[PDB]
């Protein structure tokens, strides 16, 4: 039923089995290990549940404001144990944190003494005696709020979680009868305050019944090779990452750091949370196949917080499948398949069985014929019931109703994803986020394709954004370069020409910025939203000024 009850079952079956292992690279460049069996994490959880019960009631929200580590896991679990709606947030570094706190009106804050320095009662869980030897007041419905201009908290129920896990276990392990191997372990460096990192690092170990090897996204960014190192531990690894993490690892990992790594036991590496670029997948597999990385272990995956996490993934037992389409028709709105190597390449996602996806005209609420691009709509029991205390926004995002649905298609409710895609053959494809699209003379260009063009030339971070000006959208590219005045001219004319010939677009402004200037998250590739208003308020410093 609930995560607390599943954790108590983990303790019953395998009290002394290892549940969570956290590798901390902050003091020791090589990582200090600290591990909890099922019984020990349960004890900590119960102690946190006792402490939160002094401050909040069943149903109250509990904000978690801790760094990545075991204390975060035990704050979150202890909150669910005492029947509180957890709110996983990031450690203060912030304005969106106070906006979330105002929205969720929490009755307790769970944090650590270290960031205690950075009103509801505040608990430093590390300063609690967490290993001192009941509180099962768990809810059977709402587990936690997942926060993503006003901050909207996705209500995630235990039903959402279990349904998404059943869909996930079945698609990821369809080749083994929806049974994961005995050898499975979870490895993740993804932040626990993002949906991918929370469901994979914290929730999955309990629901699947395996242990997790965990670390911090700052450890991964410092030395991406550690990711491969930790996945190559004993057993069959299951991990996940955004596309730029695949690129970064292919780029910055030294073959000396990988002395004697066996990557052949890695069960699954999901690639998600952003557009999956075939070129990235090929660079990753071509560079790490030497260590026995299996190509069928790379699994592109699509989802969003509003669907708990998972919507679709590639066929189990096969390497990712790539399809090719004519780009002029793609911008026109039509998917026309073309020969291998011609046109744009898109990762083929098999139409999922559960949840179900449809391609729908956002202006008429009617399905699109195959090959016609529209908005991806999602139906299924993993789709959240709404945004916390936001009835109107809930209605606009979750209340998709299909007019004259096709045979076998529910009328509603549909989750409108904001993503543009199409169906070809019996696979569907994701173009990208609609708000990020560049519309020029009635045509639609995707910023992921523009940035993939620019990157190959720059080898750095990009953002292709749309700046409105006197009734149209103008193309602007924020381009990170390594840090003379001719060399700058070489890159500007190269990139400008590459966008001209590959897209038929004129670049209205190329902003050469230093590395780190484009807003990125720890798990977000680029916030093209933020780029637009940083550029409009002239907050960028160029290298050629």
Q: Write the CA distances from 98 to 41, 63, 91, 95, 118, integer angstroms.
A: 30, 11, 12, 6, 12
Q: Which of 168, 330, 335, 478 binds ligand 649 (CB under 6 A)?
A: 168
Applying the rule CB under 6 A, the residues between 16 and 75 that interact with ligand 649 are: none
In the stretch 512-531, what mask flags binding to ligand 649 with x, by CB under 6 A? --------------------
Can you tell me the distance from the alpha carbon of 98 to that of 96, in angstroms, rounded to the nearest whole number? 6
Q: Which of 3, 309, 423, 477 binds ligand 649 (CB under 6 A)?
A: 309
Distance of closest approach, residue 18 Cβ to ligand 649, in angstroms: 16
Q: What is the DSSP letter of 113?
A: S
302 counts as binding ligand 649 under rule CB under 6 A = yes
Can you tell me the distance from the alpha carbon of 409 to that of 491, in angstroms, rounded to the nearest whole number? 50
- Given the rule CB under 6 A, which of 33-41, 90-98, 248-256, 266-274 is the region that contacts ligand 649? 266-274
Contacts of 503 (CB under 8 A, 6+ apart): 327, 445, 449, 450, 453
Q: Which of 515, 461, 523 is nearest to 216 (CA)?
A: 523
Applying the rule CB under 6 A, the residues between 276 and 295 that interact with ligand 649 are: 276
Can you tell me the distance from the alpha carbon of 380 to that of 385, in angstroms, rounded to the nearest whole number? 11
Can you tell me the distance from the alpha carbon of 435 to that of 466, in angstroms, rounded to the nearest whole number? 9
Distance of closest approach, residue 428 Cβ to ligand 649, in angstroms: 11
Can you tell me the distance from the alpha carbon of 189 to that of 92, in angstroms, rounded to the nearest whole number? 19
Beta carbons of 346 and 314 less than 8 angstroms apart: no
- Given the rule CB under 6 A, which of 200-208, 332-340, 403-411, 469-477 is the region that contacts ligand 649? 200-208
301 counts as binding ligand 649 under rule CB under 6 A = yes
**Residue among 293 and 304 whose Cβ is closer to ligand 649:** 304
Distance of closest approach, residue 242 Cβ to ligand 649, in angstroms: 8
Can you tell me the distance from the alpha carbon of 356 to that of 312, in angstroms, rounded to the nearest whole number? 9
**Residue among 303 and 413 whose Cβ is closer to ligand 649:** 303
Distance of closest approach, residue 86 Cβ to ligand 649, in angstroms: 17
214 counts as binding ligand 649 under rule CB under 6 A = no
196 counts as binding ligand 649 under rule CB under 6 A = yes
Can you tell me the distance from the alpha carbon of 427 to that of 430, in angstroms, rounded to the nearest whole number? 10
CB atoms within 10 A of CB 490: 10
241 counts as binding ligand 649 under rule CB under 6 A = no
172 counts as binding ligand 649 under rule CB under 6 A = yes
272 counts as binding ligand 649 under rule CB under 6 A = yes
**Residue among 64 and 510 whose Cβ is closer to ligand 649:** 64
Distance of closest approach, residue 339 Cβ to ligand 649, in angstroms: 24
CB atoms within 10 A of CB 156: 27
89 counts as binding ligand 649 under rule CB under 6 A = no
In degrees and rounded to multiples of 5, residue 12 shows phi and psi of -65, -45
CB atoms within 10 A of CB 330: 23
498 counts as binding ligand 649 under rule CB under 6 A = no
Can you tell me the distance from the alpha carbon of 72 to that of 192, in angstroms, rounded to the nearest whole number? 8
Beta carbons of 168 and 310 less than 8 angstroms apart: yes
419 counts as binding ligand 649 under rule CB under 6 A = yes
240 counts as binding ligand 649 under rule CB under 6 A = yes
CB atoms within 10 A of CB 329: 16
List % helix, strand, coil for the chain (3-state, nearest 5).
35, 25, 40
304 counts as binding ligand 649 under rule CB under 6 A = yes
Can you tell me the distance from the alpha carbon of 288 to that of 291, in angstroms, rounded to the nearest whole number? 6
In degrees and rounded to multiples of 5, residue 156 shows phi and psi of -110, 120
452 counts as binding ligand 649 under rule CB under 6 A = no
Contacts of 499 (CB under 8 A, 6+ apart): 450, 453, 454, 475, 477, 505, 506, 507
- Given the rule CB under 6 A, which of 363-371, 381-389, 416-424, 512-520 is the region that contacts ligand 649? 416-424
Distance of closest approach, residue 434 Cβ to ligand 649, in angstroms: 9
Q: Which of 55, 61, 358, 433 binds ligand 649 (CB under 6 A)?
A: 433
217 counts as binding ligand 649 under rule CB under 6 A = no
Distance of closest approach, residue 483 Cβ to ligand 649, in angstroms: 30
- Given the rule CB under 6 A, which of 59-67, 126-134, 269-277, 378-386 is the region that contacts ligand 649? 269-277
- Kindly tell me the burial class for residue 5, based on how many C-beta atoms sit within 10 Å of its own C-beta (0-12, 13-18, 19 or more): middle
Distance of closest approach, residue 357 Cβ to ligand 649, in angstroms: 12
Distance of closest approach, residue 438 Cβ to ligand 649, in angstroms: 16
100 counts as binding ligand 649 under rule CB under 6 A = no
Q: Which of 78, 88, 191, 303 binds ligand 649 (CB under 6 A)?
A: 303
- Paired tokens of 285: 């597999």
| Site size toward ligand 649, by CB under 6 A | 31
Can you tell me the distance from the alpha carbon of 456 to that of 53, in angstroms, rounded to the nearest whole number? 54
Distance of closest approach, residue 94 Cβ to ligand 649, in angstroms: 17
192 counts as binding ligand 649 under rule CB under 6 A = no
275 counts as binding ligand 649 under rule CB under 6 A = yes
> Using a CB cutoff of 8 Å and minimum separation of 24, what contacts does 438-447 make?
438/464, 438/466, 438/473, 438/475, 438/505, 439/466, 439/473, 440/472, 440/473, 440/475, 440/505, 443/331, 443/332, 444/331, 444/333, 444/373, 444/420, 445/331, 445/475, 445/503, 445/505, 446/420, 447/528
Applying the rule CB under 6 A, the residues between 323 and 382 that interact with ligand 649 are: none
270 counts as binding ligand 649 under rule CB under 6 A = yes
Distance of closest approach, residue 56 Cβ to ligand 649, in angstroms: 27
Q: Which of 46, 202, 305, 415 binds ligand 649 (CB under 6 A)?
A: 305
Q: What is the DSSP letter of 489?
A: H
- Paired tokens of 523: 């798990």
Q: Which of 79, 200, 266, 360 binds ligand 649 (CB under 6 A)?
A: 200
- Given the rule CB under 6 A, which of 38-46, 110-118, 298-306, 325-333 is the region that contacts ligand 649? 298-306
What residues line the site for ligand 649 (CB under 6 A)?
168-169, 172, 186, 195-196, 199-200, 204, 208, 238, 240, 270, 272-276, 300-305, 309-310, 417-419, 430, 433
């Amino acid at each position: 039923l609930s995560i607390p009850s599943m954790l108590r079952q983990c303790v019953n079956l395998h009290p002394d089995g290892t549940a969570f292992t956290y590798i901390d690279y902050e003091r020791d460049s090589e990582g200090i290990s600290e591990s909890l069996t099922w019984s020990q994490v349960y004890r900590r959880t119960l102690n946190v549940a006792a402490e939160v019960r002094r401050h909040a009631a069943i149903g109250d929200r509990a904000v978690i404001l801790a760094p990545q580590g075991l204390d975060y896991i035990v704050a979150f679990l202890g909150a669910l144990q005492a029947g509180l709606i957890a709110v996983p947030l990031s450690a203060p570094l912030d304005e969106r944190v106070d906006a979330v706190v105002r929205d969720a009106k929490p009755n307790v804050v769970l944090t650590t003494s270290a960031i205690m320095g950075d009103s509801p009662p505040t608990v430093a869980v590390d300063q609690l005696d967490l290993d001192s030897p009941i509180v099962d007041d768990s809810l059977q419905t709402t587990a936690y709020l997942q926060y993503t201009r006003t901050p909207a908290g996705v209500m995630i129920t235990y039903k959402n979680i279990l349904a998404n896990f059943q869909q996930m276990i079945s698609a990821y392990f369809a080749d083994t009868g929806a049974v994961p191997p005995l050898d499975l372990f979870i490895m993740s460096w993804l932040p626990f305050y993002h949906d991918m990192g929370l469901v994979l690092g914290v929730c999955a170990p309990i629901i699947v019944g395996c242990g997790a090897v965990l670390t911090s996204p700052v450890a991964f960014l410092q030395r991406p090779a550690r990711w491969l190192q930790l996945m190559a531990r004993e057993g069959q690894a299951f991990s996940a990452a955004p596309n730029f993490a695949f690129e970064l690892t292919a780029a910055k990992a030294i073959d000396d750091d990988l002395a004697g790594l066996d990557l052949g036991r890695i069960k699954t590496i999901l690639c998600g949370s952003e557009r999956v670029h075939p070129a990235t997948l090929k660079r990753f597999v071509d560079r790490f196949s030497r260590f026995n990385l299996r190509e069928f272990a790379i699994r592109p995956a699509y989802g969003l917080a509003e669907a708990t996490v998972y919507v679709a993934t590639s066929q189990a037992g096969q390497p990712p499948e790539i399809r090719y389409f004519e780009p002029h028709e793609l911008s026109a709105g039509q998917a026309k398949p073309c020969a291998t190597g011609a046109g744009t390449a898109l990762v083929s996602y098999p139409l999922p069985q559960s949840p179900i996806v449809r391609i729908v005209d956002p202006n008429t609420n009617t399905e699109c014929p195959p090959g016609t691009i529209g908005e991806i709509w999602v139906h299924g029991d993993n789709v959240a019931g709404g945004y916390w205390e936001k009835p109107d926004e809930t209605e606009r995002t979750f209340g998709g109703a299909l007019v004259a649905p096709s045979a076998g298609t529910p009328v509603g409710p549909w989750l409108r994803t904001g993503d543009s895609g199409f169906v070809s053959e019996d696979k569907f494809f994701i173009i990208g986020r609609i708000k990020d699209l560049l519309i020029v003379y009635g045509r639609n260009h995707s910023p992921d394709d523009i940035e993939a063009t620019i990157q190959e030339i720059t080898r750095g971070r990009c953002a292709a954004i749309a700046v409105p000006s006197n009734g149209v959208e103008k193309l602007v590219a924020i381009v990170e370069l390594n840090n003379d005045t001719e060399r700058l001219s070489f890159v500007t004319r190269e990139v400008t020409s590459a966008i001209s010939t590959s897209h038929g677009l004129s670049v209205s402004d190329l902003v050469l910025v230093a590395p780190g200037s484009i807003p990125i998250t720890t798990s977000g590739k680029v916030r093209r939203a933020e780029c637009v208003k940083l550029y409009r308020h002239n907050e960028f410093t160029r290298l050629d000024a």
